[PDB]
């Protein structure tokens, strides 16, 4: 931090003794089921060399975890979201730049606990008839245990540029009732993909053998609510003080097909079957310090 | 946070150097057993592009965990709440929008600790008669342990829109005396659903074999007290500066039927048997900055 | 929090730039052994739509854990508190309302750590006479461990209304010397209820076989000191600016009867044997902003 | 801290009651896939003996984890980043100096838990025919267990000078699906380097047997976003108040070659195969307190 | 703290409502590879009885972990830093004094967990031919486990005076790849000192059998960056308001000699083989409140 | 805290809106190897009924862990500090009083984890020749494990008065290389006291068989740096506004004698062999608010 270099905290930061122009822009795409909000803040710090626009994408991208097709009591299909995405893209001809962003790709870790342990035991068994017999045992304990947090969904900052930035929320692993973790690539020759199978030998029709969304992560059913900040920077001397920025929300829906083998249930997962995109273009006026749609 | 993008903290936030108009609106629905409160705050930040209304739904939704019917000493019935809900809905013809909300669906996790560990042991047993015999053992430890917090009730943000928003509190799992977790879908062929059975082979009448509410989560008996914030936003230039917002509280009550098999007790759970809704319409005056019922 | 919706912290709160009228009201009920205190704060925020009164019930409700009757060396009786209670009730004809309260029924949890772990071992024993014999062992580790905090006494918010609110402190479990947890419903056919038995085969008279209060939770002997806030709200336009509020403290005392079987000691627990209530009526003057008894 | 020497906190720090001149400088090297940002802050504290420039290198160095060459279904090649680097270098003829920097090389640790534990057991087996036989066992537990955090990537401060400073982010260890940690130097005679092998006996072509970047650390695919502060200091009396500073970003890409042995897959790792450098020269004007490219 | 004695926090501290004169003094000793910085702060608190100078030694002492000599493929030599040191010394004839310093020798601890645990088991084996045989086992668990943090390098405050003060960073223990901790005094009759041996039976020349510095602590290769504060105090009435203070940095380099036994590798460690000292004399002017070199 | 009694924090504290007169008094006793510092703060709070003097004893008491005498290769002697002490004593004829002090004797604890756990196992072994034989095992786990922090040195507040106060730092336990804890009273009939023995069967002369101070706690070699606050209080109306206070530092040095038995090494510990005291008398002027020596 700025204190670790012997500088008073908050001294190098921006926004001190300046007027900030905030605003909200909301809109609901019913077809794609997206509540999109943009919280924009214009900062003209006279001591800063550029005008700043802080664009916080927010809202909720409904997961729409839902059974979409039934071909009878033996087959069914589930649309489940495997990924969300948010992208802000400036046209290549613009003078503005994507100076900063948050969150970023924090360096994670795995707690690694190694073992170098020695045990010794001395047993000397005997009988009432006068027979003694014994052993001395030396036991070595070694190896490693790796422990870390395994979240259901990861958040990732896609490779950004001076014109494009983007976050993606990705499905990493899911824990079923008690059968253990499962991912999109899991494959059991017997049951196929057990990701969303309520039971393996169920007597109900396929449409009813899917996990109840309440048990599963709420990101799948209710959706995911991003809070992603981006910092645009413009030069005051630029002749063109108006820009157009494309804000894009995406929901990638995979197809979980459940089939009856006449013996047990089998599950297959088709990736990126559907992609639901909602793109809006926002006009940014740097002189009046406003944003509109 | 706004510090991670080199911006002074609190600079982009709203409510700086402005007068906020607060208020409380309380009412008790005796029939549905709901204490409803709305804490409203009007914010007209001249630097913000819209008028903000922060509506915090609060109060208490009595669980009403109670025995409702007795058909003798062999059968009884318990009304127990499986879910609470709070919904704020604007009519489709309104100009206002549901800009923001809290709490949201935070991404949860499960601590995943994997094992790759090696043990070696060397035993060499002997007898006093001159007989030696031994073994060398190599032992592998592998697999994973998953540990996470399992709360009795989850809080969830239902898929919102620009006109409707809603939270639901859901029953996830309950721990009986020491018999382990149980859910609404638990089913033992012997005892059926052991969710609220005080004893399996009790000699008392069914009505007395139900768990004492004090032992169980207080959400079931005393109730649940929400604190849910929503942020409405209106354009200052809109001709109609009056709106009507419907605040809805719901208690979903399931029926736990306890039966005597002449050998032991059996429990069944009928979901969403009853639904108790309390809806109020609040008139919002954005010019006088007030809310009324 | 209000920061999570992009609003400066403390902006929507009450009490900014206003004069608050505080006061203390104390009284000791010797008969019921209750030190009752009420800390009242009148808040007239001109920007708020109602007058607020924050009533913090405090003090100490002596547990009075005590031997009350002795019928000889074989029988004795202990009065021990199983529950405390605090209730604030407004008469039904009043215009005021119980807007808010604290503490509430926080959603608790139980840390659930599940296991899916595999072990493999390979033993190959041998003798010096030339005889080898071995085994290969595959071991499965599964199940769950549930770990949570188990306090001696719970605090609960009884189902409130717009006129009545109430907290109850309840005895949940107690740990004896080292014999494990015990509750009011514990029953051993041999010893009955071992909740407060110092010893099972004691040679002393019954009155001396009870747990020393110092070993036990201080809530039983010295008592419990509540800190419970309630928020009354009144409309400024109401013609009647005087109200009467009933503050009630209760101590529920159960009877632990200890008997000699001529072989060992047995304990029985009669619930809610006695109920000690101390009720006071406080006159609230909203114009002079004071409270009196 | 400055409080531990009886000095009021923040008293010895810089930036109190002074005007700070901030700025952003952004640029995207498409060829090397680097988003470079420099956040500069000029501090002229009249009570300080020198002018300070705080240069925070930021941005994102795309990992570019990607299959680069395929020679058929038996061989493939992956370019994966093993290291990132950021260097600020002043020409030797300059009067300015690199006074400070952050982050630095914090002293790490390993939790060392040693054991000195004794167990004793006494077994006395018997048969119904009247034969008793027993043993007394003394068991010693000793040794040590070492547990520490093992991150995927380390951050390091290269040996700095008064003209050059530099950070390097280094690949330390990676955890595959569940096969354990692997590093650049790992070598199995059977499989070679299993760092990025999706499967050992896969039937797919080599290009498809590489780990999905989503599973792997996002530093490899999306990239790494530095936040590295440096503090330049200049004497006010220096005649030459203009300097040129070279900011350098580097991505070191190693080649992971995957080969088919007709039995299983083998992996080899060629270190530092490619080095992608993006260097910019920034003109620093200490009189106008600005930086340009 | 000052609050624990009923005194408002920060009241007894220095630097309140006074002007502080700061400064940086930087210099790079190429020969010894030291980046030396001194951050000085002059404090003349009119309410304090003396003038204070806070001297924070900072910078980086390059470890210079490096192979220095090769006599062929069987022998090699590594210069590795075992200790860093920083010393501030005033000449004995000066009137100034070393009033305070930081960091100091904090009292450490070792978590000591003792055991007094009892287990009992009852086995009763039987055969289908009608033969029963059993045992009752009582098992005692006792002893202690000691767990504490074992850092690679310790920081120590050498015995100070009113004229000399000094910190030393010392090599305590290092963890090799997975062979366990090693120190300067470790000695295996087979391998000697295994501190920096990459492999025990390597086929490469000695110079290539040394640990890669990236694997090892960065203090060895990149170096150590001190932050050590000292507080000089002078009497205002002293006639001589100029002083000379000697700031000394030291790097102690040990020689790790690796030899080939024609069977395996052996390592020896010669302590304090080289000592690299960089001493500077700083002129302190207490009247103009400055420091120079 | 003062908030828990409904009082604004810091309201009852001292030092609000008053001028505080600070000062440092330093001196080095070479013979006893003590760097003594006194940080004094005079507080005359007009709202307080007395004048306060906060005296913080600080500095460093060199441990002087050192070999003092050698009688050959078979015997040696080590002077090691077992205790430090700081005492402030007012003459009995003074009007001033020792009102307060810090640190004090905080109530410590030991984490006590008790066990009441049941295991059951069912084994049923069989042979291929048609012979089955089995057992059912019930296992009880009980007892307690006590875990707490065991520091090398304790800090203690000696029984104070209105004229004398004193802290003592005491040697509690030390951990050797890996042989376990040892104290001053430890005694092995074979090796005597193994507190500072580098090896048990060493071939080096006794003087070289002592633990290296770097391995041991730095309190022994470099020393201990106290920070002990005392609060003197004087009545303003007292005629004699001058006092004399004796500040005393002590180092208690024990003698660790190491002897050669011609078989192994033996260690003996003579307690409180030497006591090194450094006493200074400070003149306190309450009118001019100063302290001198």
UniProtKB/Swiss-Prot annotation, chains A, B, C, D, E, F:
GO terms for cellular component: extracellular region. SUPFAM superfamilies: Leukocidin-like (SSF56959). One of its GO terms (molecular function) is toxin activity. The keyword Secreted applies. Changing residue 259 to I/P/R/S: Nearly wild-type oligomerization, hemolysis and target cell binding. GO terms for biological process: cytolysis in another organism. Changing residue 259 to L: 46% of normal hemolytic activity, slowly toxic in mice. The mushroom-shaped heptamer is composed of a cap domain (comprising 7 beta sandwiches and the amino latches of each protomer), 7 rim regions whose protruding strands may interact with the membrane bilayer, and the stem domain (52 Angstroms in length, 26 Angstroms in diameter) which forms the transmembrane pore. Self-assembles to first form a non-lytic oligomeric intermediate, and then, a mushroom-shaped homoheptamer structure of 100 Angstroms in length and up to 100 Angstroms in diameter. Interacts with human ADAM10; this interaction is required for toxin pore formation, disruption of focal adhesions, and hly-mediated cytotoxicity. Alpha-toxin binds to the membrane of eukaryotic cells (particularly red blood cells, RBC) forming pores, resulting in hemolysis, with the release of low-molecular weight molecules leading to eventual osmotic RBC lysis. Human RBCs bind much less alpha-toxin than do rabbit RBCs. Heptamer oligomerization and pore formation is required for lytic activity. This is Alpha-hemolysin.
């Amino acid at each position: 931090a700025d204190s670790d270099i012997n500088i008073k905290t908050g001294t190098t930061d921006i926004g001190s003794n300046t007027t900030v122009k905030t605003g909200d822009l909301v809109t609901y795409d019913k077809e794609n089921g997206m509540h999109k909000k943009v919280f924009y803040s214009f900062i003209d710090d006279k001591n800063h060399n550029k005008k700043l626009l802080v664009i916080r994408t927010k809202g909720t991208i409904a997961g729409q975890y839902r059974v979409y097709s039934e071909e009878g009591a033996n087959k069914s299909g589930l649309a489940w979201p495997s990924a969300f995405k948010v992208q802000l893209q400036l046209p290549d001809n613009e003078v503005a730049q994507i100076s900063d962003y948050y969150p970023r790709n924090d360096a994670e870790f795995r707690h690694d606990s190694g073992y170098e342990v020695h045990h010794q035991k001395l047993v000397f068994f005997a009988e009432d008839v006068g027979s003694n017999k014994g052993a001395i045992i030396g036991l070595m304990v070694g190896g490693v245990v790796i422990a870390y947090v395994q979240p259901d969904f990861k958040t990732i900052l896609e490779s950004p540029t001076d014109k494009k930035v983007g976050w993606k929320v990705i499905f990493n692993n899911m824990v079923n009732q008690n059968w253990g973790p499962y991912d999109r690539d899991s494959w059991n020759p017997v049951y196929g993909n057990q990701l969303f199978m309520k039971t393996r030998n169920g007597s109900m029709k396929a449409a009813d053998n899917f996990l109840d969304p309440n048990k599963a992560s709420s990101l799948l059913s209710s959706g995911f609510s991003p809070d992603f900040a981006t910092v645009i920077t413009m030069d005051r001397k630029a002749s063109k003080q108006q820009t157009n920025i494309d804000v894009i929300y995406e929901r990638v829906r995979d197809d979980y097909q459940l089939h009856w083998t006449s013996t047990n249930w089998k599950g297959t997962n088709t990736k990126d079957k559907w992609t639901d995109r909602s793109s809006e273009r926002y006009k940014i006026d740097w002189e009046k310090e406003e944003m509109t749609n």
